[model samples]
Target: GVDKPGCRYLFGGCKSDDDCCPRLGCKGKGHDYCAWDGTFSD
Candidate 1:
């Protein structure tokens, strides 16, 4: 659990997408990848 001193709450990158979405999406700049595609098995 990592916290960014700027925004206050836990930033996604501050920790990891494992704490955000199911698994780390195709990380990059174009998609940002925070939005889930709803194709997860679990």
Candidate 2:
């Protein structure tokens, strides 16, 4: 888990280009690292 700053969990769904900053995204279920473009990068 990256810094909490500007970090939040999107309790909905992701396609492949949302806004996952710091960390990656949950992909779909809504639970995991941050959220960077639906992919998994900083």
Candidate 3:
């Protein structure tokens, strides 16, 4: 499993771009959250 900054999980709230997992990207307008980079999307 991946690490957490105090029980914070993937797709959860983030403070920075690198706050998410390796394949996820932290982004949002109203609030920051983890999302896919669309590297392997269909």
Candidate 4:
């Protein structure tokens, strides 16, 4: 299981939504991380 949601690993670095999570995507308005919510937004 991952801590950073969409990220395959907690420490998986990301440069964009695709990096963090493709289907679920990522979030980074103030901080960069994954959004593993069943409902996602990039």
Candidate 5:
């Protein structure tokens, strides 16, 4: 299951794409964390 929006942005580590929030993504190697992927729909 995916984490809630605010949960994965606070020093939160991730394992897969679904592990991050809607506009963010899981990044980094050996230290995967949620990061903004610059996906602006506006």
Candidate 6:
């Protein structure tokens, strides 16, 4: 919502952080906005 050059999605099940981009990630629940991509700091 900060209007950055990044992105926003809703992907999951990635083994490591390298599998995802700066704005993209994976969701364990496999839904619109969920991820177990180790984004605890987010």
Best by lDDT: 5
Give the whole-model CA lDDT for all candidates, comma-separated. Answer: 0.37, 0.45, 0.65, 0.50, 0.69, 0.43
Instruction: Give the Å shift of residue 12 in candidate 4.
Output: 4.2
Candidate 3, residues 1-42: lDDT per residue as tens digits? 124555445568776766766667777666678776744886
Question: For candidate 1, lDDT tens digit of each residue in 1-42?
Answer: 122333322224423343344423334554433444445666
Q: Mark the 10 consecutive residues where model 5 has the least summed lDDT.
A: 1-10
Greater lDDT among 1 and 3 belongs to: 3
Question: Lowest-scoring 10 consecutive residues by lDDT in candidate 2?
Answer: 12-21
Off by over 4 Å in 1: 1-19, 23-26, 38-42
Q: Candidate order by lDDT, highest to lowest?
A: 5, 3, 4, 2, 6, 1
Tens digits of lDDT, candidate 4, 1-42: 223554553334444766654444456656555545565344
Better of 3 and 6 by TM-score: 3
lDDT, model 4, position 10:
38
The C-alpha stretches of model 4 lying farther than 4 A from their native spots are 1-13, 39-42
* Candidate 2 residue 5 C-alpha distance from true site, Å: 8.9
Please tell me which predicted candidate would have the highest TM-score against the true structure. 5
Residues 1-42 of candidate 2 have per-residue lDDT tens digits of: 244456456543434433443455545444533445535443
Predicted structure 5: lDDT: 0.69
**Model 5 over residues 1-42: C-alpha lDDT tens digits?**
254845577347887877877767887678778776766655
User: How do the candidates rank by TM-score, highest first?
Assistant: 5, 3, 4, 6, 2, 1
- What's the CA error at residue 5 for candidate 4, in Å? 16
Clash pairs detected, candidate 3: none
Shift of residue 1 alpha carbon in model 6, Å = 18
TM-score of each: 0.22, 0.22, 0.56, 0.36, 0.57, 0.26
Q: Which stretches of candidate 3 lie over 4 Å from their true place?
A: 1-10
Mark the regions of model 2 whose C-alpha exceeds 4 Å error after superposition.
1-11, 26-42
